[PDB]
């Protein structure tokens, strides 16, 4: 039967609490938290992942940056992109910016 109590923080699956600031990006923090947990499940490594990479780059999958989004659209972006950058390499700005992975027009 399922246990009576479960707390994945005790097992090392959860990063510290973050602050989305003045931006409607809770969908991105929910999605990075679930991805941080499944990458720890797979590899035993807990790394804070980038909500900014989702806010800036997952518009093709249906998200709207600081104007709202869905965790499933963020998970589709992760699979399309082959992963997600770390928070340390692609830090949070609490505003939608250009996706550096978009070549744009030249």
């Amino acid at each position: 039967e399922a246990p009576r109590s479960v707390d994945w923080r005790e097992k090392g699956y959860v990063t510290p609490v973050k602050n989305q600031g003045q931006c409607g990006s809770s969908w991105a923090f929910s999605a990075t938290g679930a991805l941080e947990g499944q990458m720890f499940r797979k590899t035993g490594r807990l790394i804070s992942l980038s909500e900014q990479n989702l806010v800036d780059c997952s518009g093709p999958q249906g998200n709207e940056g600081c104007n709202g989004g869905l965790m499933d659209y963020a998970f589709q972006y992760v699979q399309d992109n082959g992963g997600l950058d770390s928070e340390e390499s692609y830090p949070y700005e609490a505003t939608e910016e250009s996706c550096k992975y978009n070549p744009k027009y030249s």
């Binding site: 959860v14 609490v17 938290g33 679930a34 499944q38 499940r41």
Partner: protein
């Protein structure tokens, strides 16, 4: 190939997924001042909707308060409004009270 698994809209299905998979993304109705000013304890808001969710959060576990005589189960939820909100940034959401705030209505996790 979609990159995620959707959990059926039921708290027992969510409980099994949390126990077997790890933290799960969920959405809740966070549009009540009781949640904006939440500080501690099991959160129960009589006027919460199980259909109109507007805020994504992360279920990292579940448990129960043995010194409370009924309505004592909760979901352990990580929010993203910083550590000064709630219990160091976390909230204990009422569990097994008719899908309170829609916590089991839009639950999923990524495939890796």
């Amino acid at each position: 190939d979609a990159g995620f698994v959707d959990i059926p809209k039921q708290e027992k299905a969510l409980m099994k997924a949390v126990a077997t998979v790890g933290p799960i993304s969920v959405a809740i109705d966070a549009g009540h001042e009781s949640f904006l000013f939440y500080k501690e304890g099991i959160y129960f808001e009589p006027d919460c909707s199980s259909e109109d969710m507007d805020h994504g959060v992360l279920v990292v576990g579940y448990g129960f308060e043995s010194t409370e005589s009924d309505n004592n189960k909760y979901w352990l939820v990580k929010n993203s409004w910083g550590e000064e909100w709630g219990m160091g940034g976390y909230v204990k959401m009422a569990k097994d009270r008719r899908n309170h705030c829609g916590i089991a209505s839009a639950a999923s996790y990524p495939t890796v």
